[PDB]
Amino acid sequence: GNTTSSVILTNYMDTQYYGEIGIGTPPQTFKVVFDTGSSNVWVPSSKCSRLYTACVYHKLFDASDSSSYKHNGTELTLRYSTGTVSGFLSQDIITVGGITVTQMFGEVTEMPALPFMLAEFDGVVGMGFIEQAIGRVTPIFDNIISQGVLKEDVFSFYYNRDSESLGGQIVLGGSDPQHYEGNFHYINLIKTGVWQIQMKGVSVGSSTLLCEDGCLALVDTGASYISGSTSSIEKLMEALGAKKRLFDYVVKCNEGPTLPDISFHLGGKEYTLTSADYVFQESYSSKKLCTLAIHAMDIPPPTGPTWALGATFIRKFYTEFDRRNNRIGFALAR
Amino acid sequence: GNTTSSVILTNYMDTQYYGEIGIGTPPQTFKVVFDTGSSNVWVPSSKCSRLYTACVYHKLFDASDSSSYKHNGTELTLRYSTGTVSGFLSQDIITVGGITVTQMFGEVTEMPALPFMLAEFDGVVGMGFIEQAIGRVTPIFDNIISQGVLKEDVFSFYYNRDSSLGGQIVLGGSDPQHYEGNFHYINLIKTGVWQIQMKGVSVGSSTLLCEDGCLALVDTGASYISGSTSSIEKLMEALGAKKRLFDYVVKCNEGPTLPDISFHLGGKEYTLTSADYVFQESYSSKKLCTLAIHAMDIPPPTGPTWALGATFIRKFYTEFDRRNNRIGFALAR
Numbered sequence: 211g212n213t214t215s216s217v218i219l220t221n222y223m224d225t226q227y228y229g230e231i232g233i234g235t236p237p238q239t240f241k242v243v244f245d246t247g248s249s250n251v252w253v254p255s256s257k258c259s260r261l262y263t264a265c266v267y268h269k270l271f272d273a274s275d276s277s278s279y280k281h282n283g284t285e286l287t288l289r290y291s292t293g294t295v296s297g298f299l300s301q302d303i304i305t306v307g308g309i310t311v312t313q314m315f316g317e318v319t320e321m322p323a324l325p326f327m328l329a330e331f332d333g334v335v336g337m338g339f340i341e342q343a344i345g346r347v348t349p350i351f352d353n354i355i356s357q358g359v360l361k362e363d364v365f366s367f368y369y370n371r372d373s374e375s376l377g378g379q380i381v382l383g384g385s386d387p388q389h390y391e392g393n394f395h396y397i398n399l400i401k402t403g404v405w406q407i408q409m410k411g412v413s414v415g416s417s418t419l420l421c422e423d424g425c426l427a428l429v430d431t432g433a434s435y436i437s438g439s440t441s442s443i444e445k446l447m448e449a450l451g452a453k454k455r456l457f458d459y460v461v462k463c464n465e466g467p468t469l470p471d472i473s474f475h476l477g478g479k480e481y482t483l484t485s486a487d488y489v490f491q492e493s494y495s496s497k498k499l500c501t502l503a504i505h506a507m508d509i510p511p512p513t514g515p516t517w518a519l520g521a522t523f524i525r526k527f528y529t530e531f532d533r534r535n536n537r538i539g540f541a542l543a544r
Numbered sequence: 545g546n547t548t549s550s551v552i553l554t555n556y557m558d559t560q561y562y563g564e565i566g567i568g569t570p571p572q573t574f575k576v577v578f579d580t581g582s583s584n585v586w587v588p589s590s591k592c593s594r595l596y597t598a599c600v601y602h603k604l605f606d607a608s609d610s611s612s613y614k615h616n617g618t619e620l621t622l623r624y625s626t627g628t629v630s631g632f633l634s635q636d637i638i639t640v641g642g643i644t645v646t647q648m649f650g651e652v653t654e655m656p657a658l659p660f661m662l663a664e665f666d667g668v669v670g671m672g673f674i675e676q677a678i679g680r681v682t683p684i685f686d687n688i689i690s691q692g693v694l695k696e697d698v699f700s701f702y703y704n705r706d707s708s709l710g711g712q713i714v715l716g717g718s719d720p721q722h723y724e725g726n727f728h729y730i731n732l733i734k735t736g737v738w739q740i741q742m743k744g745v746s747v748g749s750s751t752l753l754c755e756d757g758c759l760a761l762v763d764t765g766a767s768y769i770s771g772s773t774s775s776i777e778k779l780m781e782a783l784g785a786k787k788r789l790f791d792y793v794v795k796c797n798e799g800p801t802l803p804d805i806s807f808h809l810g811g812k813e814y815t816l817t818s819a820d821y822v823f824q825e826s827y828s829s830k831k832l833c834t835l836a837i838h839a840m841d842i843p844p845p846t847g848p849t850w851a852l853g854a855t856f857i858r859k860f861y862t863e864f865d866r867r868n869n870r871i872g873f874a875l876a877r
């Protein structure tokens with residue numbers, strides 16, 4: 211076909227990038243997160259216990275105000291690495307920047323405070339294959355593709371950096387030659403079903419101080435940070451001088467602007483992040499500490515163990531999620 | 545051609561703005577400073593001596609690492625206003641934005657603490673004309689032009705106030721996201737150098753400095769605006785700034801109090817307020833804030849000149865027009 215669409219994204223702190231979707235007629239608008247580590251949608255439910263503060267604090271979907279709605283009803287649990295969310299399935303029309311799909315989605319009626327209370331977005335839009343969908347429900351894009359609108363069978367990520375800007379943007383169908391420079395480098399996934407890519411190594415410094423003899427890289431938009439297995443990060447951090455705490459990694463602020471280059475030996479290229487890319491310099495004091503933008507995560511099999519290239523890296527490199535030919539391409543951005 | 549290549553820039557303390565470049569095959573990455581005041585490209589040699597604490601903390605070029613690398617060994621001393629550096633000439637491919645070109649880069653081997661240590665980046669990329677070149681080696685832009693890939697033979701500069709995005713260079717034109725209105729150019733007095741002529745420095749209402757013509761280098765790799773010791777001396781008096789052990793400070797609390805400083809360029813006035821000159825770390829009556837202007841005596845031939853640095857560039861988006869050999873300005877955003 212010939213459709214191209216955007217979805218304008220709001221960059222909230224370099225940690226959260228959400229768009230907006232509408233469900234039901236009249237539309238009920240929601241701040242969702244576009245997530246290539248999942249294949250499901252879900253948005254708070256009217257039916258949700260108000261004893262769930264997140265449910266007091268977000269926008270709930272009320273089906274009784276949706277003439278376009280078809281009760282389904284199956285319980286589903288969406289457990290993500292940072293938190294779980296049980297609910298049940300409904301169906302209605304979703305409007306995703308341009309495209310209308312009768313989406314099969316889920317009414318979250320148990321929304322935990324941790325993390326959700328710190329969430330700026332209401333729900334999530336999974337952009338991973340059906341080979342991961344809980345309940346085996348045909349995923350949003352999978353529906354846009356069965357629609358024959360799309361000029362091209364790809365979706366691309368642009369993640370801006372903050373402003374005191376244009377936050378980011380997805381493009382369903384195409385790519386945006388005003389977000390990148392040069393040309394793409396294509397890496398083609400291992401199995402289909404997961405956005406993974408083989409990684410030939412990780413160089414903090416110059417020396418491949420990690421992933422020598424390869425490892426795997428999952429490409430995910432729903433990840434604020436870069437993640438690497440526990441020991442993998444233990445070592446990286448070690449190299450790097452970083453203080454391991456509870457949730458994040460730290461560094462004397464002043465220390466920041468000199469932390470060495472870290473590189474991803476990806477599909478043959480070397481994808482380097484300099485410390486201006488992984489260091490949240492909110493200062494240069496010897497007294498204040500500074501939060502890196504990399505952090506462990508042990509991902510259990512079957513997907514894991516993997517490195518997860520989140521928001522951190524998509525911010526430096528435009529990413530082309532290519533369904534047709536089944537591969538992912540990156541470009542340097544603008 | 546029809547390309548255009550931005551290079552995102554880091555801003556270390558509103559004083560240093562540096563981007564990345566990659567040399568050789570495979571590309572090897574360094575942090576550089578794109579200098580309109582210089583015309584040689586140089587980065588540390590791996591051949592650089594450990595005793596130089598400097599090379600010690602700075603990215604180095606292992607030529608063994610580049611397949612494309614080509615030998616030249618012709619010795620090079622580069623001598624800047626705040627330092628002299630020195631090594632020999634090499635030849636590889638350079639990446640700049642999505643652009644890639646073979647260059648005559650210098651591979652540094654004698655590099656001092658002062659200033660070298662100050663530096664957060666590793667090298668320099670001189671956006672100067674050939675004319676002002678050591679070894680008379682064609683400057684980087686000089687090649688790229690010839691590559692015939694870029695739409696316009698111009699490069700823009702956006703310096704950002706620090707608090708993000710700290711700057712960005714446009715090789716091939718301008719990023720209209722970063723300027724307000726249109727440019728008002730200013731012809732080069734003459735090729736070779738990036739210097740226009742100023743018709744007067746104002747303190748509020750009146751010209752005081754530069755009553756009958758002066759020079760102004762618009763320079764990207766100089767932090768502060770500079771004047772001759774003797775004009776700046778006059779300048780700090782109208783202000784009531786005081787030299788303090790090093791440079792001129794103010795009682796922060798009195799920032800808001802100071803007269804706008806005005807650069808008469810090509811008929812129009814380029815006007816900087818306190819907001820833009822003082823580094824108001826605070827608004828304390830208890831603190832001294834420092835100004836972002838310095839006395840800096842440039843030698844003949846290029847001197848005496850005023851020199852608009854990052855201070856001024858922060859305000860006025862700069863357009864370096866190779867083609868017309870003019871310099872255009874516009875309000876950054």
Ligand SMILES: C[C@@H](c1ccccc1)N(CC(=O)N(C)C)C(=O)C[C@@H](Cc1csc(N)n1)C(=O)N[C@@H](CC1CCCCC1)[C@@H](O)[C@@H]1CC(C)(C)N(C)C1=O
Pocket residue numbers: 225243245246247248289290291292293325326328329330334428430432433434435436437505507509513518519520
């Ligand atoms: C803590 C969590 C969070 C908190 C509040 C609000 C929003 C998000 N964060 C922010 C965060 O990590 N920092 C450091 C602030 C995530 O990025 C969440 C990210 C954690 C992570 C895992 S690997 C990595 N690099 N980061 C994740 O779970 N991301 C989920 C989807 C989330 C989208 C936003 C709503 C919550 C679910 C799947 O991408 C991950 C990836 C995959 C497939 C391995 N897997 C099974 C998952 O569950």
Ligand SMILES: C[C@@H](c1ccccc1)N(CC(=O)N(C)C)C(=O)C[C@@H](Cc1csc(N)n1)C(=O)N[C@@H](CC1CCCCC1)[C@@H](O)[C@@H]1CC(C)(C)N(C)C1=O
Pocket residue numbers: 559577579580581582623624625626627659660662663668761763765766767768769770838840842846851853
């Ligand atoms: C210390 C020096 C520096 C150098 C290296 C690293 C860190 C800092 N600094 C910061 C500085 O002086 N303050 C006060 C922040 C410069 O701005 C440097 C600037 C000083 C200057 C001269 S006129 C003026 N207003 N400011 C300069 O010498 N700039 C050089 C090239 C430098 C680029 C960064 C690496 C060190 C060399 C040419 O632009 C100048 C311009 C000209 C024409 C005077 N000439 C011959 C030069 O060599």
